[PDB]
C-alpha cells in the first residue's frame, strides 16, 4: 500500500470519507473491484503496522460480516493525478461478556473498533482524529461507549489525548473498554 492506485480514486470516491458495508456498493471499469482492491491493500498495510501475521480486514471479510468501513481519501492533489487513500477505520457491533469492578459479568453488545490505520507517511497529521470523529457522528456513539479489539498502545495514547479515555477493568476476551463504559461509571 502506497496510497495510490492505477485508477482514479476521486472519481470512485467523490466524498472525503466514504462509508461501506458488506455489499461494498460503489458510490453514484468494475468499480466494485476497485473498492475491493483498496480494502485488501488497506487491510494488509494495517496488519503489518500492528505486527499481525495476516490481515483482519479484506474485501472477502467485509462481504461475510456485518462490519462497516469508513475510508478517508486524500483531499490534496497528488502528482500522479489520480487521487489517493489515507486510511480507514472499521467498526462492528459484537456480543461480549465483560467483567466490571463489582465482580459482575455484564452481557453487552457495544459498537467495537475492529481495525484502524492511517498510512505511515501521514500519521500524526490529524487524519486519524478526523476519521474517528466522522465515525462517532454517523454511528451516534460516544468514545467511552466503545470496546476495542486488542488496541495498540498508539491508539490508547490517541484516545487519552483526544478524548481523555482511561482503560477500565481488564478483560479475558481481548477487548479493551474505558472508564464510563459501565452504567455506574462516568465519562471523563
Amino acid at each position: 500500500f502506497t496510497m495510490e492506485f492505477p485508477f482514479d480514486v476521486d472519481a470512485l470516491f467523490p466524498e472525503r470519507i466514504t462509508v461501506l458495508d458488506q455489499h461494498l456498493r460503489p458510490p453514484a471499469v468494475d468499480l466494485q473491484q476497485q473498492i475491493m482492491t483498496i480494502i485488501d491493500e488497506l487491510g494488509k498495510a494495517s496488519a503489518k503496522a500492528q505486527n499481525l501475521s495476516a490481515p483482519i480486514t479484506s474485501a472477502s471479510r467485509m462481504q461475510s460480516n456485518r462490519h462497516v468501513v469508513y475510508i478517508l481519501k486524500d483531499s490534496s492533489a497528488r502528482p500522479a493525478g489520480k487521487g489517493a487513500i489515507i486510511g480507514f477505520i472499521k467498526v462492528g457491533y459484537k456480543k461480549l461478556f465483560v467483567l466490571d469492578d463489582r465482580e459482575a459479568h455484564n452481557e453487552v453488545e457495544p459498537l467495537c473498533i475492529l481495525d484502524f490505520y492511517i498510512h505511515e507517511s501521514v500519521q500524526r497529521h490529524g487524519h486519524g482524529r478526523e476519521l474517528f470523529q466522522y465515525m462517532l457522528q454517523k454511528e451516534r456513539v460516544e468514545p467511552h461507549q466503545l470496546a476495542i479489539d486488542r488496541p495498540s498502545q498508539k491508539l490508547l495514547k490517541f484516545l487519552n489525548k483526544h478524548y481523555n479515555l482511561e482503560t477500565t477493568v481488564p478483560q479475558v476476551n481481548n477487548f479493551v473498554i474505558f472508564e464510563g463504559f459501565f452504567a455506574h461509571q462516568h465519562p471523563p
Binding site: 500492528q50 499481525l52 483482519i56 475492529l114 479489539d149 486488542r150 476476551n173 481481548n174 477487548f175
Partner: peptide, 4 residues
C-alpha cells in the same frame, strides 16, 4: 476478537 479477530486480533488473535
Amino acid at each position: 476478537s479477530d486480533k488473535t
